[PDB]
Amino acid sequence: FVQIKFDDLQFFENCGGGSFGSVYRAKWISQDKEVAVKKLLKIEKEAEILSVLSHRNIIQFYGVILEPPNYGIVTEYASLGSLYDYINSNRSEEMDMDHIMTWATDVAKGMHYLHMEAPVKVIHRDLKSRNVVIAADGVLKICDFGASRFHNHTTHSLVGTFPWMAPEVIQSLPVSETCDTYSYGVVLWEMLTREVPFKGLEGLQVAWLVVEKNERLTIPSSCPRSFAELLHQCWEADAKKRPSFKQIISILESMSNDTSLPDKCNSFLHNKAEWRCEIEATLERLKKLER
Ligand SMILES: *CCC(=O)N1CC[C@@H](Oc2n[nH]c3ncc(-c4cn(-c5c(F)ccc(NS(=O)(=O)c6cccc(-c7ccccc7)c6)c5F)nn4)cc23)C1
Does one domain contain both 29 and 144?
Answer: no
Q: Is 79 annotated in some ligand binding site?
A: no
| Resolution expressed in Å | 2.5
> Which of 44, 79, 114 represents a domain boundary (last residue)?
79
Backbone angles phi, psi at 263, to 5 degrees: -65, -50
**Distance in Å, CA 263 to ligand 1 centroid:** 36
Does one domain contain both 69 and 38?
Answer: yes
Angle at 290 between CA 287 and CA 291, to 5 degrees: 90
Distances 152 to 20, 54, 125, 159, 179 between C-alpha atoms, Å: 10, 22, 11, 16, 17
Does one domain contain both 173 and 270?
Answer: yes
**Distance in Å, CA 111 to ligand 1 centroid:** 16
Q: Give the separation between CA 112 and CA 181, rounded to whole angstroms.
A: 10
Q: Give the separation between CA 98 and CA 249, rounded to whole angstroms.
A: 15
Does one domain contain both 101 and 145?
Answer: yes
Name the residue type at position 127: L
**Distance in Å, CA 150 to ligand 1 centroid:** 14
Let me know: does 276 contact 222? Beta carbons within 8 Å.
no
Tell me how the structure was determined. Answer: X-ray
Residues 6+ apart with CB under 8 A from 275: 220, 221, 222, 223, 268
Q: Is 38 annotated in some ligand binding site?
A: yes
Q: How many CB atoms lie within 10 A of CB 244?
A: 18
Q: Is residue 129 within 6 Å of ligand 1 at its C-beta?
A: no
- Which candidate, 81, 98, 85, 106, places its Cα nearest to that of 184? 106
Residue 34 belongs to domain spanning: 1-79
Q: Is residue 9 within 6 Å of ligand 1 at its C-beta?
A: no
**CA 41: distance to chain centroid?**
24
Q: Give the separation between CA 201 and CA 287, rounded to whole angstroms.
A: 7
Give the 3-state secondary structure of residue 107: helix
Q: Is 221 annotated in some ligand binding site?
A: no
